[PDB]
């Protein structure tokens, strides 16, 4: 029922306000966020945990409207990764 999106974005402060604000503004459900800079690179990854809705490709179209988003993919990792990750904190 859930998917991970991998976003490749330009790393500046703050593309994350752009992306987070997009998700709030349009009432997209998000149930886990992880952002990490890509090493030796001017880019960062944003991973989102979304629902595999009828709404999902509209979600992607919206996200691809952001200038700083260089790419957005459906990421093949299991969606129960996110929750399990909490264990390391």
């Amino acid at each position: 029922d859930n998917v991970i999106l991998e976003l490749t974005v330009r790393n500046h402060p703050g593309v994350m306000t752009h992306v987070c604000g997009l998700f709030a503004r349009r009432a997209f459900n998000v149930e886990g966020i992880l952002c990490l800079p890509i090493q030796d690179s001017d880019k960062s990854h944003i991973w989102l945990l979304v629902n595999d809705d009828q709404r999902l490709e509209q979600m992607i179209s919206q996200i691809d409207k952001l200038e700083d988003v260089v790419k957005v993919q459906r990421n093949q990792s299991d969606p129960t990764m996110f929750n399990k990750i909490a264990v390391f904190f």
Partner: protein, 531 residues
């Protein structure tokens, strides 16, 4: 060629062909103003309120087809730009908005602009200033256009650095499959009752949209943003559809078996209740923004492209059918439909009898705007300037000022109401000091009015907080701003003469506050449920 940041900004603006720039100076933007004093190419118009600066930039932009630029300082200058920029966003207009900011070493202008811009910038060092501006002007004008906000710290403006800036031009339009164009041509050729549904996105393709409408003999309806895409009297013109559209065509659309949607976005105010809007109609939808395809109605053929390029590849494949029986049906439904001195409609008609097709028409927001949309014979693209998406009161007068500046030859008539005109009343000064050819046609109902109609028709306790006493003299005010005034009280002779002679003018007309914009679709209703 070595520049200070401010001098580079001005030089870049020159090389994009900007001849006019409008704003208001303040501390954090004073360096650019210094550089701007030296330009032999760019004149600067001093607004009286940064919202006014932005809407004047908007009037330029809505008439040229190119980005227009407005400028303000940090803090209240930036915050005052907000409404103008958000209005630019929802109606898809190319604006570049430049704001000074405190030295990099306050108000979060970047943060505030995030949700109301097509993109925005905070220039943190001067080495980014070339790319920033070149990309801003690309972003503002490509695909679906919009405002870009560039915030530039004062210490970046007064820095110096070393570089030749070209004219940024539009990104290339998307590609689209020939199978798609074939499938649409087949659906149009095989449709019993098609309608062509035009929106604000077809605005730079009047030739091919007309060619298509007439070849296939399509009944064509327009949104508020598409008025003039066919001349008002055109025999295929269903006029405008929707909340206050024309009843006959609201019923006619429900008879359609296929609708061809070019440059429209199925806004509720044109469509009504989505699921009850043309249920028996297959849909073709061509839009430059992927995110609009399937956002509200799911199309059977969806093309993400520029309308011109599609219609170029589509018109030679569309057969030329008389569609005789469908036209008899259109006419039969029209023979059951309402129809229209110093009346509100009569005033619109009288003002139109004063000018050419060469006029530019601007409006504020409310009943006077819907009345004007209904009755004025708008017959040219980029002749009709209204705020539709955001629906901003106060858009009209500064938009007309911009239109005047961008076309000094033409006449700009601005249909306004008593409530909206006060929102940017200060720009009256801006109109007279530049001696611009803008004629405000004020329908003064001594009421808000669109609210007056919504409360009286739909809320149980009726009109509240929507009326004025009538102890405001608008002629006195417009005269004190330096405009000629008129109060119909030969009336026409005074009208034609006040329009004929140059300079900015205010023309005032009393209208009963009980008058209505009909038909109306109650909010949340189907388009077949009209009052």
């Amino acid at each position: 060629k070595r520049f200070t940041g401010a001098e580079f900004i001005v030089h870049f603006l020159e090389q994009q062909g900007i001849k006019i720039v409008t704003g208001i100076p303040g501390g954090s933007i004073l360096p650019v103003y210094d550089a701007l004093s030296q330009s032999t190419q760019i004149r600067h118009i001093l607004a009286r309120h940064e919202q006014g600066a932005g809407f004047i930039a908007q009037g330029m932009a809505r008439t040229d087809g190119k980005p227009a630029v407005c400028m303000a300082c940090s803090g209240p200058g930036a915050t005052n730009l907000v409404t103008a920029i958000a209005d630019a966003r929802l109606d898809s207009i190319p604006l570049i908005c430049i704001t000074g900011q405190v030295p990099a070493s306050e108000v979060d202008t970047y943060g505030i602009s995030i949700p109301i811009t097509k993109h925005n910038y905070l220039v943190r060092h001067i080495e980014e200033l070339p790319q920033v501006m070149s990309d801003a002007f690309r972003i503002a004008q490509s695909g679906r256009p919009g405002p870009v906000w560039i915030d530039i710290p004062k210490d970046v403006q007064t820095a110096v650095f070393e570089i030749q800036p070209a004219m940024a031009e539009k990104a290339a339009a998307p590609a689209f499959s020939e199978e798609s164009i074939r499938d649409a041509a087949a659906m149009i050729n095989a449709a019993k009752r098609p309608v062509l549904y035009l929106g604000g996105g077809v605005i730079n393709a009047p030739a091919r949209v007309r060619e298509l409408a007439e070849k296939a003999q399509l009944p064509t309806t327009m949104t508020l943003m598409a008025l003039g895409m066919l001349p008002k009297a055109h025999p295929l013109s269903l006029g405008m559809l929707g909340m206050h559209g024309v009843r006959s065509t609201n019923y006619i659309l429900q008879e359609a078996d296929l609708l061809i949607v070019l440059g429209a976005r199925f806004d509720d105010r044109a469509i009504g209740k989505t699921e009850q809007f043309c249920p028996n109609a297959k849909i073709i939808h061509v839009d430059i923004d992927r995110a609009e395809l399937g956002k509200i109605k799911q199309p059977h053929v969806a093309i993400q492209a520029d309308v011109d390029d599609v219609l170029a590849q589509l018109i030679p494949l569309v057969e030329a059918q008389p569609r005789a029986e469908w036209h008899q049906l259109v006419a039969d439904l029209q023979r059951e439909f309402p129809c229209p001195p110093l009346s509100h409609y009569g005033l619109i008609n009288a003002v139109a009898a004063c000018v050419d097709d060469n006029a530019i028409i601007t409006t504020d927001v409310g009943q006077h705007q819907m009345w004007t949309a209904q009755a004025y014979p708008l017959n040219r693209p980029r002749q009709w300037l209204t705020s539709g998406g955001l629906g901003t009161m106060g858009f009209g007068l500064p938009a007309a000022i911009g239109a005047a500046l961008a076309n000094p030859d033409r006449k700009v008539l601005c249909f306004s109401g008593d409530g909206s005109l006060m929102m940017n009343i200060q720009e009256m000064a801006t109109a007279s000091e530049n001696q611009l050819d803008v004629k405000i046609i004020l329908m003064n109902n001594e009421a808000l009015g669109l609210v007056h109609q919504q409360q009286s028709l739909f809320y149980e306790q009726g009109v509240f907080a929507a009326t004025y006493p009538g102890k405001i003299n608008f002629m006195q005010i417009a005269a004190g701003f330096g405009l000629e005034t008129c109060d119909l009280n030969d009336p026409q002779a005074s009208l034609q003469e006040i329009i004929n002679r140059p300079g900015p003018a205010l023309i005032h007309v009393r209208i009963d506050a009980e008058e209505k914009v009909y038909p109306m679709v109650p909010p949340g209703a189907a388009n077949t449920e009209m009052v």
